[PDB]
């Protein structure tokens, strides 16, 4: 499904992303926007045999298993298909584990490029959270 900006913000808040490890809700809303336009079914093939899945485009080479990616480590110990669900539960759990690594949200290039250091709070402003 394709979430509405505010709808996703509320959902992310419900899923505990606001201030998770020091990252305000805006960061996640902005990251989701640039990575997939709030689309849970978004996918992307990479030069290697890996694919990015979901609203936060998580990679199958390191974070999830799709049963057809060379060098899969499945850090999130989850089927990549779970990251394409209309229910964001799995994508959030994995995002939290990813951000729990030393490089925080820097794991998402789009976030660094389009959100890092910006007034991310603007992404949830106007919403009724």
């Amino acid at each position: 499904k394709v979430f509405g900006r505010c709808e996703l913000a509320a959902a992310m808040k419900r899923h505990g992303l606001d201030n998770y490890r020091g990252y305000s809700l805006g960061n996640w809303v902005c990251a989701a926007k640039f990575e997939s336009n709030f689309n849970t079914q978004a996918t992307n093939r990479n030069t290697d045999g890996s694919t990015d899945y979901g609203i936060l485009q998580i990679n199958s080479r390191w974070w999830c298993n799709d049963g057809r990616t060379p060098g899969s480590r499945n850090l999130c110990n989850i089927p990549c298909s779970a990251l394409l669900s209309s229910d964001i539960t799995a994508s959030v759990n994995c995002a939290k584990k990813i951000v729990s690594d030393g490089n925080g949200m820097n794991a998402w290039v789009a976030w660094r490029n389009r959100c890092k250091g910006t007034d991310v709070q603007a992404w949830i402003r106007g919403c009724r959270l």
Partner: antibody, heavy 113, light 108 residues
Framework: EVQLQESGPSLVKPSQTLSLTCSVT????????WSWIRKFPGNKLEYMGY???????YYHPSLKSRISITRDTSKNQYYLQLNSVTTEDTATYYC???????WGAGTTVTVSS | DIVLTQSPATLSVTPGDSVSLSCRAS??????LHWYQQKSHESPRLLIK???QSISGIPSRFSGSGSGTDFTLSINSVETEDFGMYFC?????????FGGGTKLEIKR
């Protein structure tokens, strides 16, 4: 399935270093984040710290300076080092996955002279 | 550091009765609260993650609810093998911290 096992000296003298090994079986040590948790005498649990895939580590500030967590990819094990211990470091030490789905049986380490 | 306060310190029940355990956070932690069970001579076992998410392989009588600073672990009809310690743990901020635990004991 993945299983963890702690091992190491069960007795450490005050001021010396405590060392523990966690052997990972069933999966690679580089395919998950790993941590150390200790349980003091009165059901007091302390999350000592963890090591993530990038090698980055997070240590409990109470411990900060004394603790070090490392891993060995060829042996598929990760370790805990805690310097200058005192009797207050006597506890049951556990290694576990960051997710908390897998835990070792735990091993007691006593600090005494 | 975030402080987690669990109450009551101890709870005595008869197998078959249902119970509710409380865990309060000194700061809001959204849904980043986890529940662990630890029996005597055994290591901790994860029962509920992120406040209310069920763990495949964990008995259905265990469920969790709450958000922010108020959480609850519920056990519908406590079974004989369910007695022991129960701890909550937050992963919202480093360092991760544990509650003091609640001891579930047998009533007689």
């Amino acid at each position: 399935e993945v299983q963890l096992q702690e091992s190491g000296p069960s007795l450490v003298k005050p001021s010396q270093t405590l060392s523990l090994t966690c052997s990972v079986t069933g999966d690679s040590v580089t395919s998950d984040f790993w941590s150390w948790i200790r349980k003091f005498p009165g059901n007091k649990l302390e999350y000592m710290g963890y090591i993530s895939y990038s090698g980055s580590t997070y240590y409990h500030p109470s411990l900060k300076s004394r603790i070090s967590i490392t891993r060995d990819t060829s042996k598929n094990q990760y370790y805990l080092q805690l310097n200058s211990v005192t009797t207050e470091d006597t506890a049951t030490y556990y290694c576990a996955s960051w997710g908390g789905d897998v835990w070792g049986a735990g091993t007691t380490v006593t600090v005494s002279s | 550091d975030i402080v987690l306060t669990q109450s009551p310190a101890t709870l005595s029940v008869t197998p078959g009765d249902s119970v509710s355990l409380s865990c309060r956070a000194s700061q809001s932690i959204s849904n980043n609260l986890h529940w662990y069970q630890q029996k005597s001579h055994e290591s901790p076992r994860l029962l509920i993650k992120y406040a209310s998410q069920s763990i495949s392989g964990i008995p259905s009588r265990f469920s969790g609810s709450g958000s922010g600073t108020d959480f609850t672990l519920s056990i519908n009809s406590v079974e004989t093998e369910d007695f022991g310690m129960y701890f909550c743990q937050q992963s919202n901020s480093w360092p991760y911290t544990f509650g003091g635990g609640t001891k579930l004991e047998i009533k007689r």
